[PDB]
Design a protein around this ligand. Structure first.
Ligand SMILES: NS(=O)(=O)c1ccc(NC(=O)COc2ccc3c(c2)OC(=O)CC3)cc1
Ligand SMILES: [Zn+2]
Length: 257
């Protein structure tokens, strides 16, 4: 099956998922000089005060913190979006070394990790239908650099021992995702895709300019997770990122001058 190894990694995905060579694939390099300020972009509206986290799962490619998305509780609106997008899960991508790990890059710079807060357009009724639509998802991407610890991430870090291997899950209630945001909501935006199979071209990408700082110990703990299931040779969950894909016929717009 697909993964991030030499024999099943990103260069192989097109054989089972031909859209991997499509016209709006993600991630991309964000060339900050070529991104144009769009004064018609509105501020992002992040309404997470009623978020209800439920569970954390190691799915064999990352860990997902999952939310109750059966009502409008944690929603993203505004920015480039029309309508209301409900938070369903967040996860990260990260490297084996602090110098790599992000999916998006900024002037070819790689951050140590990248957080994806995944939301689906409520006009499509549930997540499975949304991913079949060109405006079905809005993913908020936030870069992680290594420096000072992020206090709001520590609850995530400390449960990872309990989901070391693929298929393990743990209760994860009462987690506040606002503790993962940077101060500024300035962003870049462009039309793209899921960055893992099935690579569907259903995502409005909203990538924040301001990274968050996490400590070396925090990302160290991400790197102790396993891609494999319990009882099967240990493969550390590192470098679970897809590299930048061709921009093709797309413009990245900036919300800020
Ligand atoms: N890296 S990315 O572009 O942000 C990116 C973001 C999101 C995805 N896809 C998903 O999360 C899938 O969600 C699901 C899928 C299946 C089921 C679910 C929830 O619940 C169940 O009942 C069992 C079935 C891929 C990539
Ligand atoms: Zn992701």
């Amino acid at each position: 099956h697909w993964g991030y190894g030499k024999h099943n990694g990103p260069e192989h995905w097109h054989k089972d998922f031909p859209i991997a060579k499509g016209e709006r694939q993600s991630p991309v390099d964000i060339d900050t000089h070529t991104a144009k300020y769009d004064p018609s972009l509105k501020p992002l509206s992040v309404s997470y005060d009623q978020a209800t986290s439920l569970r954390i799962l190691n799915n064999g490619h990352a860990f997902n913190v999952e939310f109750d998305d059966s009502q409008d509780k944690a929603v993203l609106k505004g920015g480039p979006l029309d309508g209301t997008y409900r938070l369903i899960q967040f996860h990260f991508h990260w490297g084996s070394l602090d110098g790599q790990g992000s999916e998006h890059t900024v002037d070819k710079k790689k951050y140590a990790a990248e957080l994806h807060l995944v939301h689906w357009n409520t006009k499509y009724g549930d997540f499975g239908k949304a991913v079949q639509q060109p405006d079905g998802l809005a993913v908020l991407g936030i870069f992680l650099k290594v420096g000072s610890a992020k206090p709001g991430l520590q609850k995530v870090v400390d449960v990872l021992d309990s989901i070391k291997t693929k298929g393990k899950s743990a209760d994860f209630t009462n987690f506040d995702p606002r503790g993962l945001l940077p101060e500024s909501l300035d962003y870049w935006t462009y039309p793209g895709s899921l960055t893992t199979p099935p690579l569907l071209e259903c995502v409005t990408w909203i990538v924040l300019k301001e990274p968050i700082s996490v400590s070396s110990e925090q990302v160290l703990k991400f790197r102790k997770l396993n891609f494999n299931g319990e009882g099967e040779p240990e493969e550390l969950m590192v470098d679970n990122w897809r590299p930048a894909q061709p921009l093709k016929n797309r413009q990245i717009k900036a919300s800020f001058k």
